[PDB]
């Protein structure tokens, strides 16, 4: 029943002036599993107007379920164009106290890095479909 909140401070890999903060709340149950995932991960995002997908790519053994996130807030400075962004994790911070009202303004998707075989499968399959 107890809620935690993690702050991930991010900077754009191609422009360190462009910065973001990701606030994630979870049940303290999984707080440790979550931090481990993030510790061993890259963060990418796709902005489509008011829709913000946050891709947490993990090397960690266990890849969390998306539902372990209760709320998630993504804020950037400045505002960014629609598109894709590769972020660097600058700082992780636990401030479990989730007293602050949180806008659920993004949706996090956890995943693993893709093997060369799976990647080859897609190459084969997309070549067939799109005809390249």
């Amino acid at each position: 029943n107890s809620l935690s909140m993690i702050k991930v401070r991010l900077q754009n890999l191609f422009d360190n002036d462009e910065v973001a903060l990701l606030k994630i709340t979870c049940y303290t149950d999984k707080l440790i599993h979550l931090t481990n995932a993030l510790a061993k991960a890259v963060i990418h995002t796709i902005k489509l107007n008011g829709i913000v997908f946050v891709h947490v790519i993990t090397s960690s053994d266990i890849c969390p379920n998306n539902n372990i996130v209760v709320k998630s807030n993504f804020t950037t400075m400045p505002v960014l164009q629609n598109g894709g962004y590769i972020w660097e994790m600058m700082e992780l911070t636990h401030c479990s106290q989730p007293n602050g009202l949180i806008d659920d303004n993004c949706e996090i998707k956890f995943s693993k890095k893709l093997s060369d075989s799976t990647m080859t499968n897609y190459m084969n399959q997309l070549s067939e479909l799109l005809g390249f």
């Binding site: 796709i46 489509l48 997908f53 891709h55 629609n82 598109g83 659920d104 998707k109 799109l130």
Partner: protein
């Protein structure tokens, strides 16, 4: 919103082939020409993590909305789930002759519960983009 097209979206799971009827809407103001489109579109789900570095090309896109006619909710709940886990739909337009629109990408927001279609203005650029991400 304004209905622009209706037809079928053939989802090939490549684990077989689920076929789901759907409509494409554009905004009140918008105008799109769908008469040359086929009645059936073919889609394969890919991890949308792969789309990140196609960001600039995607941004130069027409955005449309897909609405599923819920004929088989069973099929749709599979789509909601996989796409919700972080899979986007690569949607091929079957043509034996050259037309304008050949591909769009379908993204699903679990929060907002909407399917967005992105139609690249640069169709050739995009397909070549896809290739260059997946090729090695």
């Amino acid at each position: 919103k304004l209905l622009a097209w209706s037809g079928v979206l053939e989802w090939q799971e490549k684990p077989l082939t689920r076929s789901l009827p759907c409509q494409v809407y554009v905004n009140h103001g918008e105008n799109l020409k769908t008469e040359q489109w086929p009645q059936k579109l073919i889609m394969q789900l890919i991890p949308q993590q792969l789309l990140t570095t196609l960001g600039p090309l995607f941004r130069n896109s027409r955005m449309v909305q897909f609405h599923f006619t819920n004929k088989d909710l069973e099929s749709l709940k599979g789509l909601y789930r996989i796409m919700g886990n972080g899979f986007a739909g690569c949607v091929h337009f079957p043509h034996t002759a050259p037309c304008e629109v050949r591909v769009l990408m379908l993204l699903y927001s679990s929060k907002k519960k909407i399917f967005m279609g992105l139609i690249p203005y640069d169709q050739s650029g995009f397909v070549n983009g896809i290739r260059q991400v997946i090729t090695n």
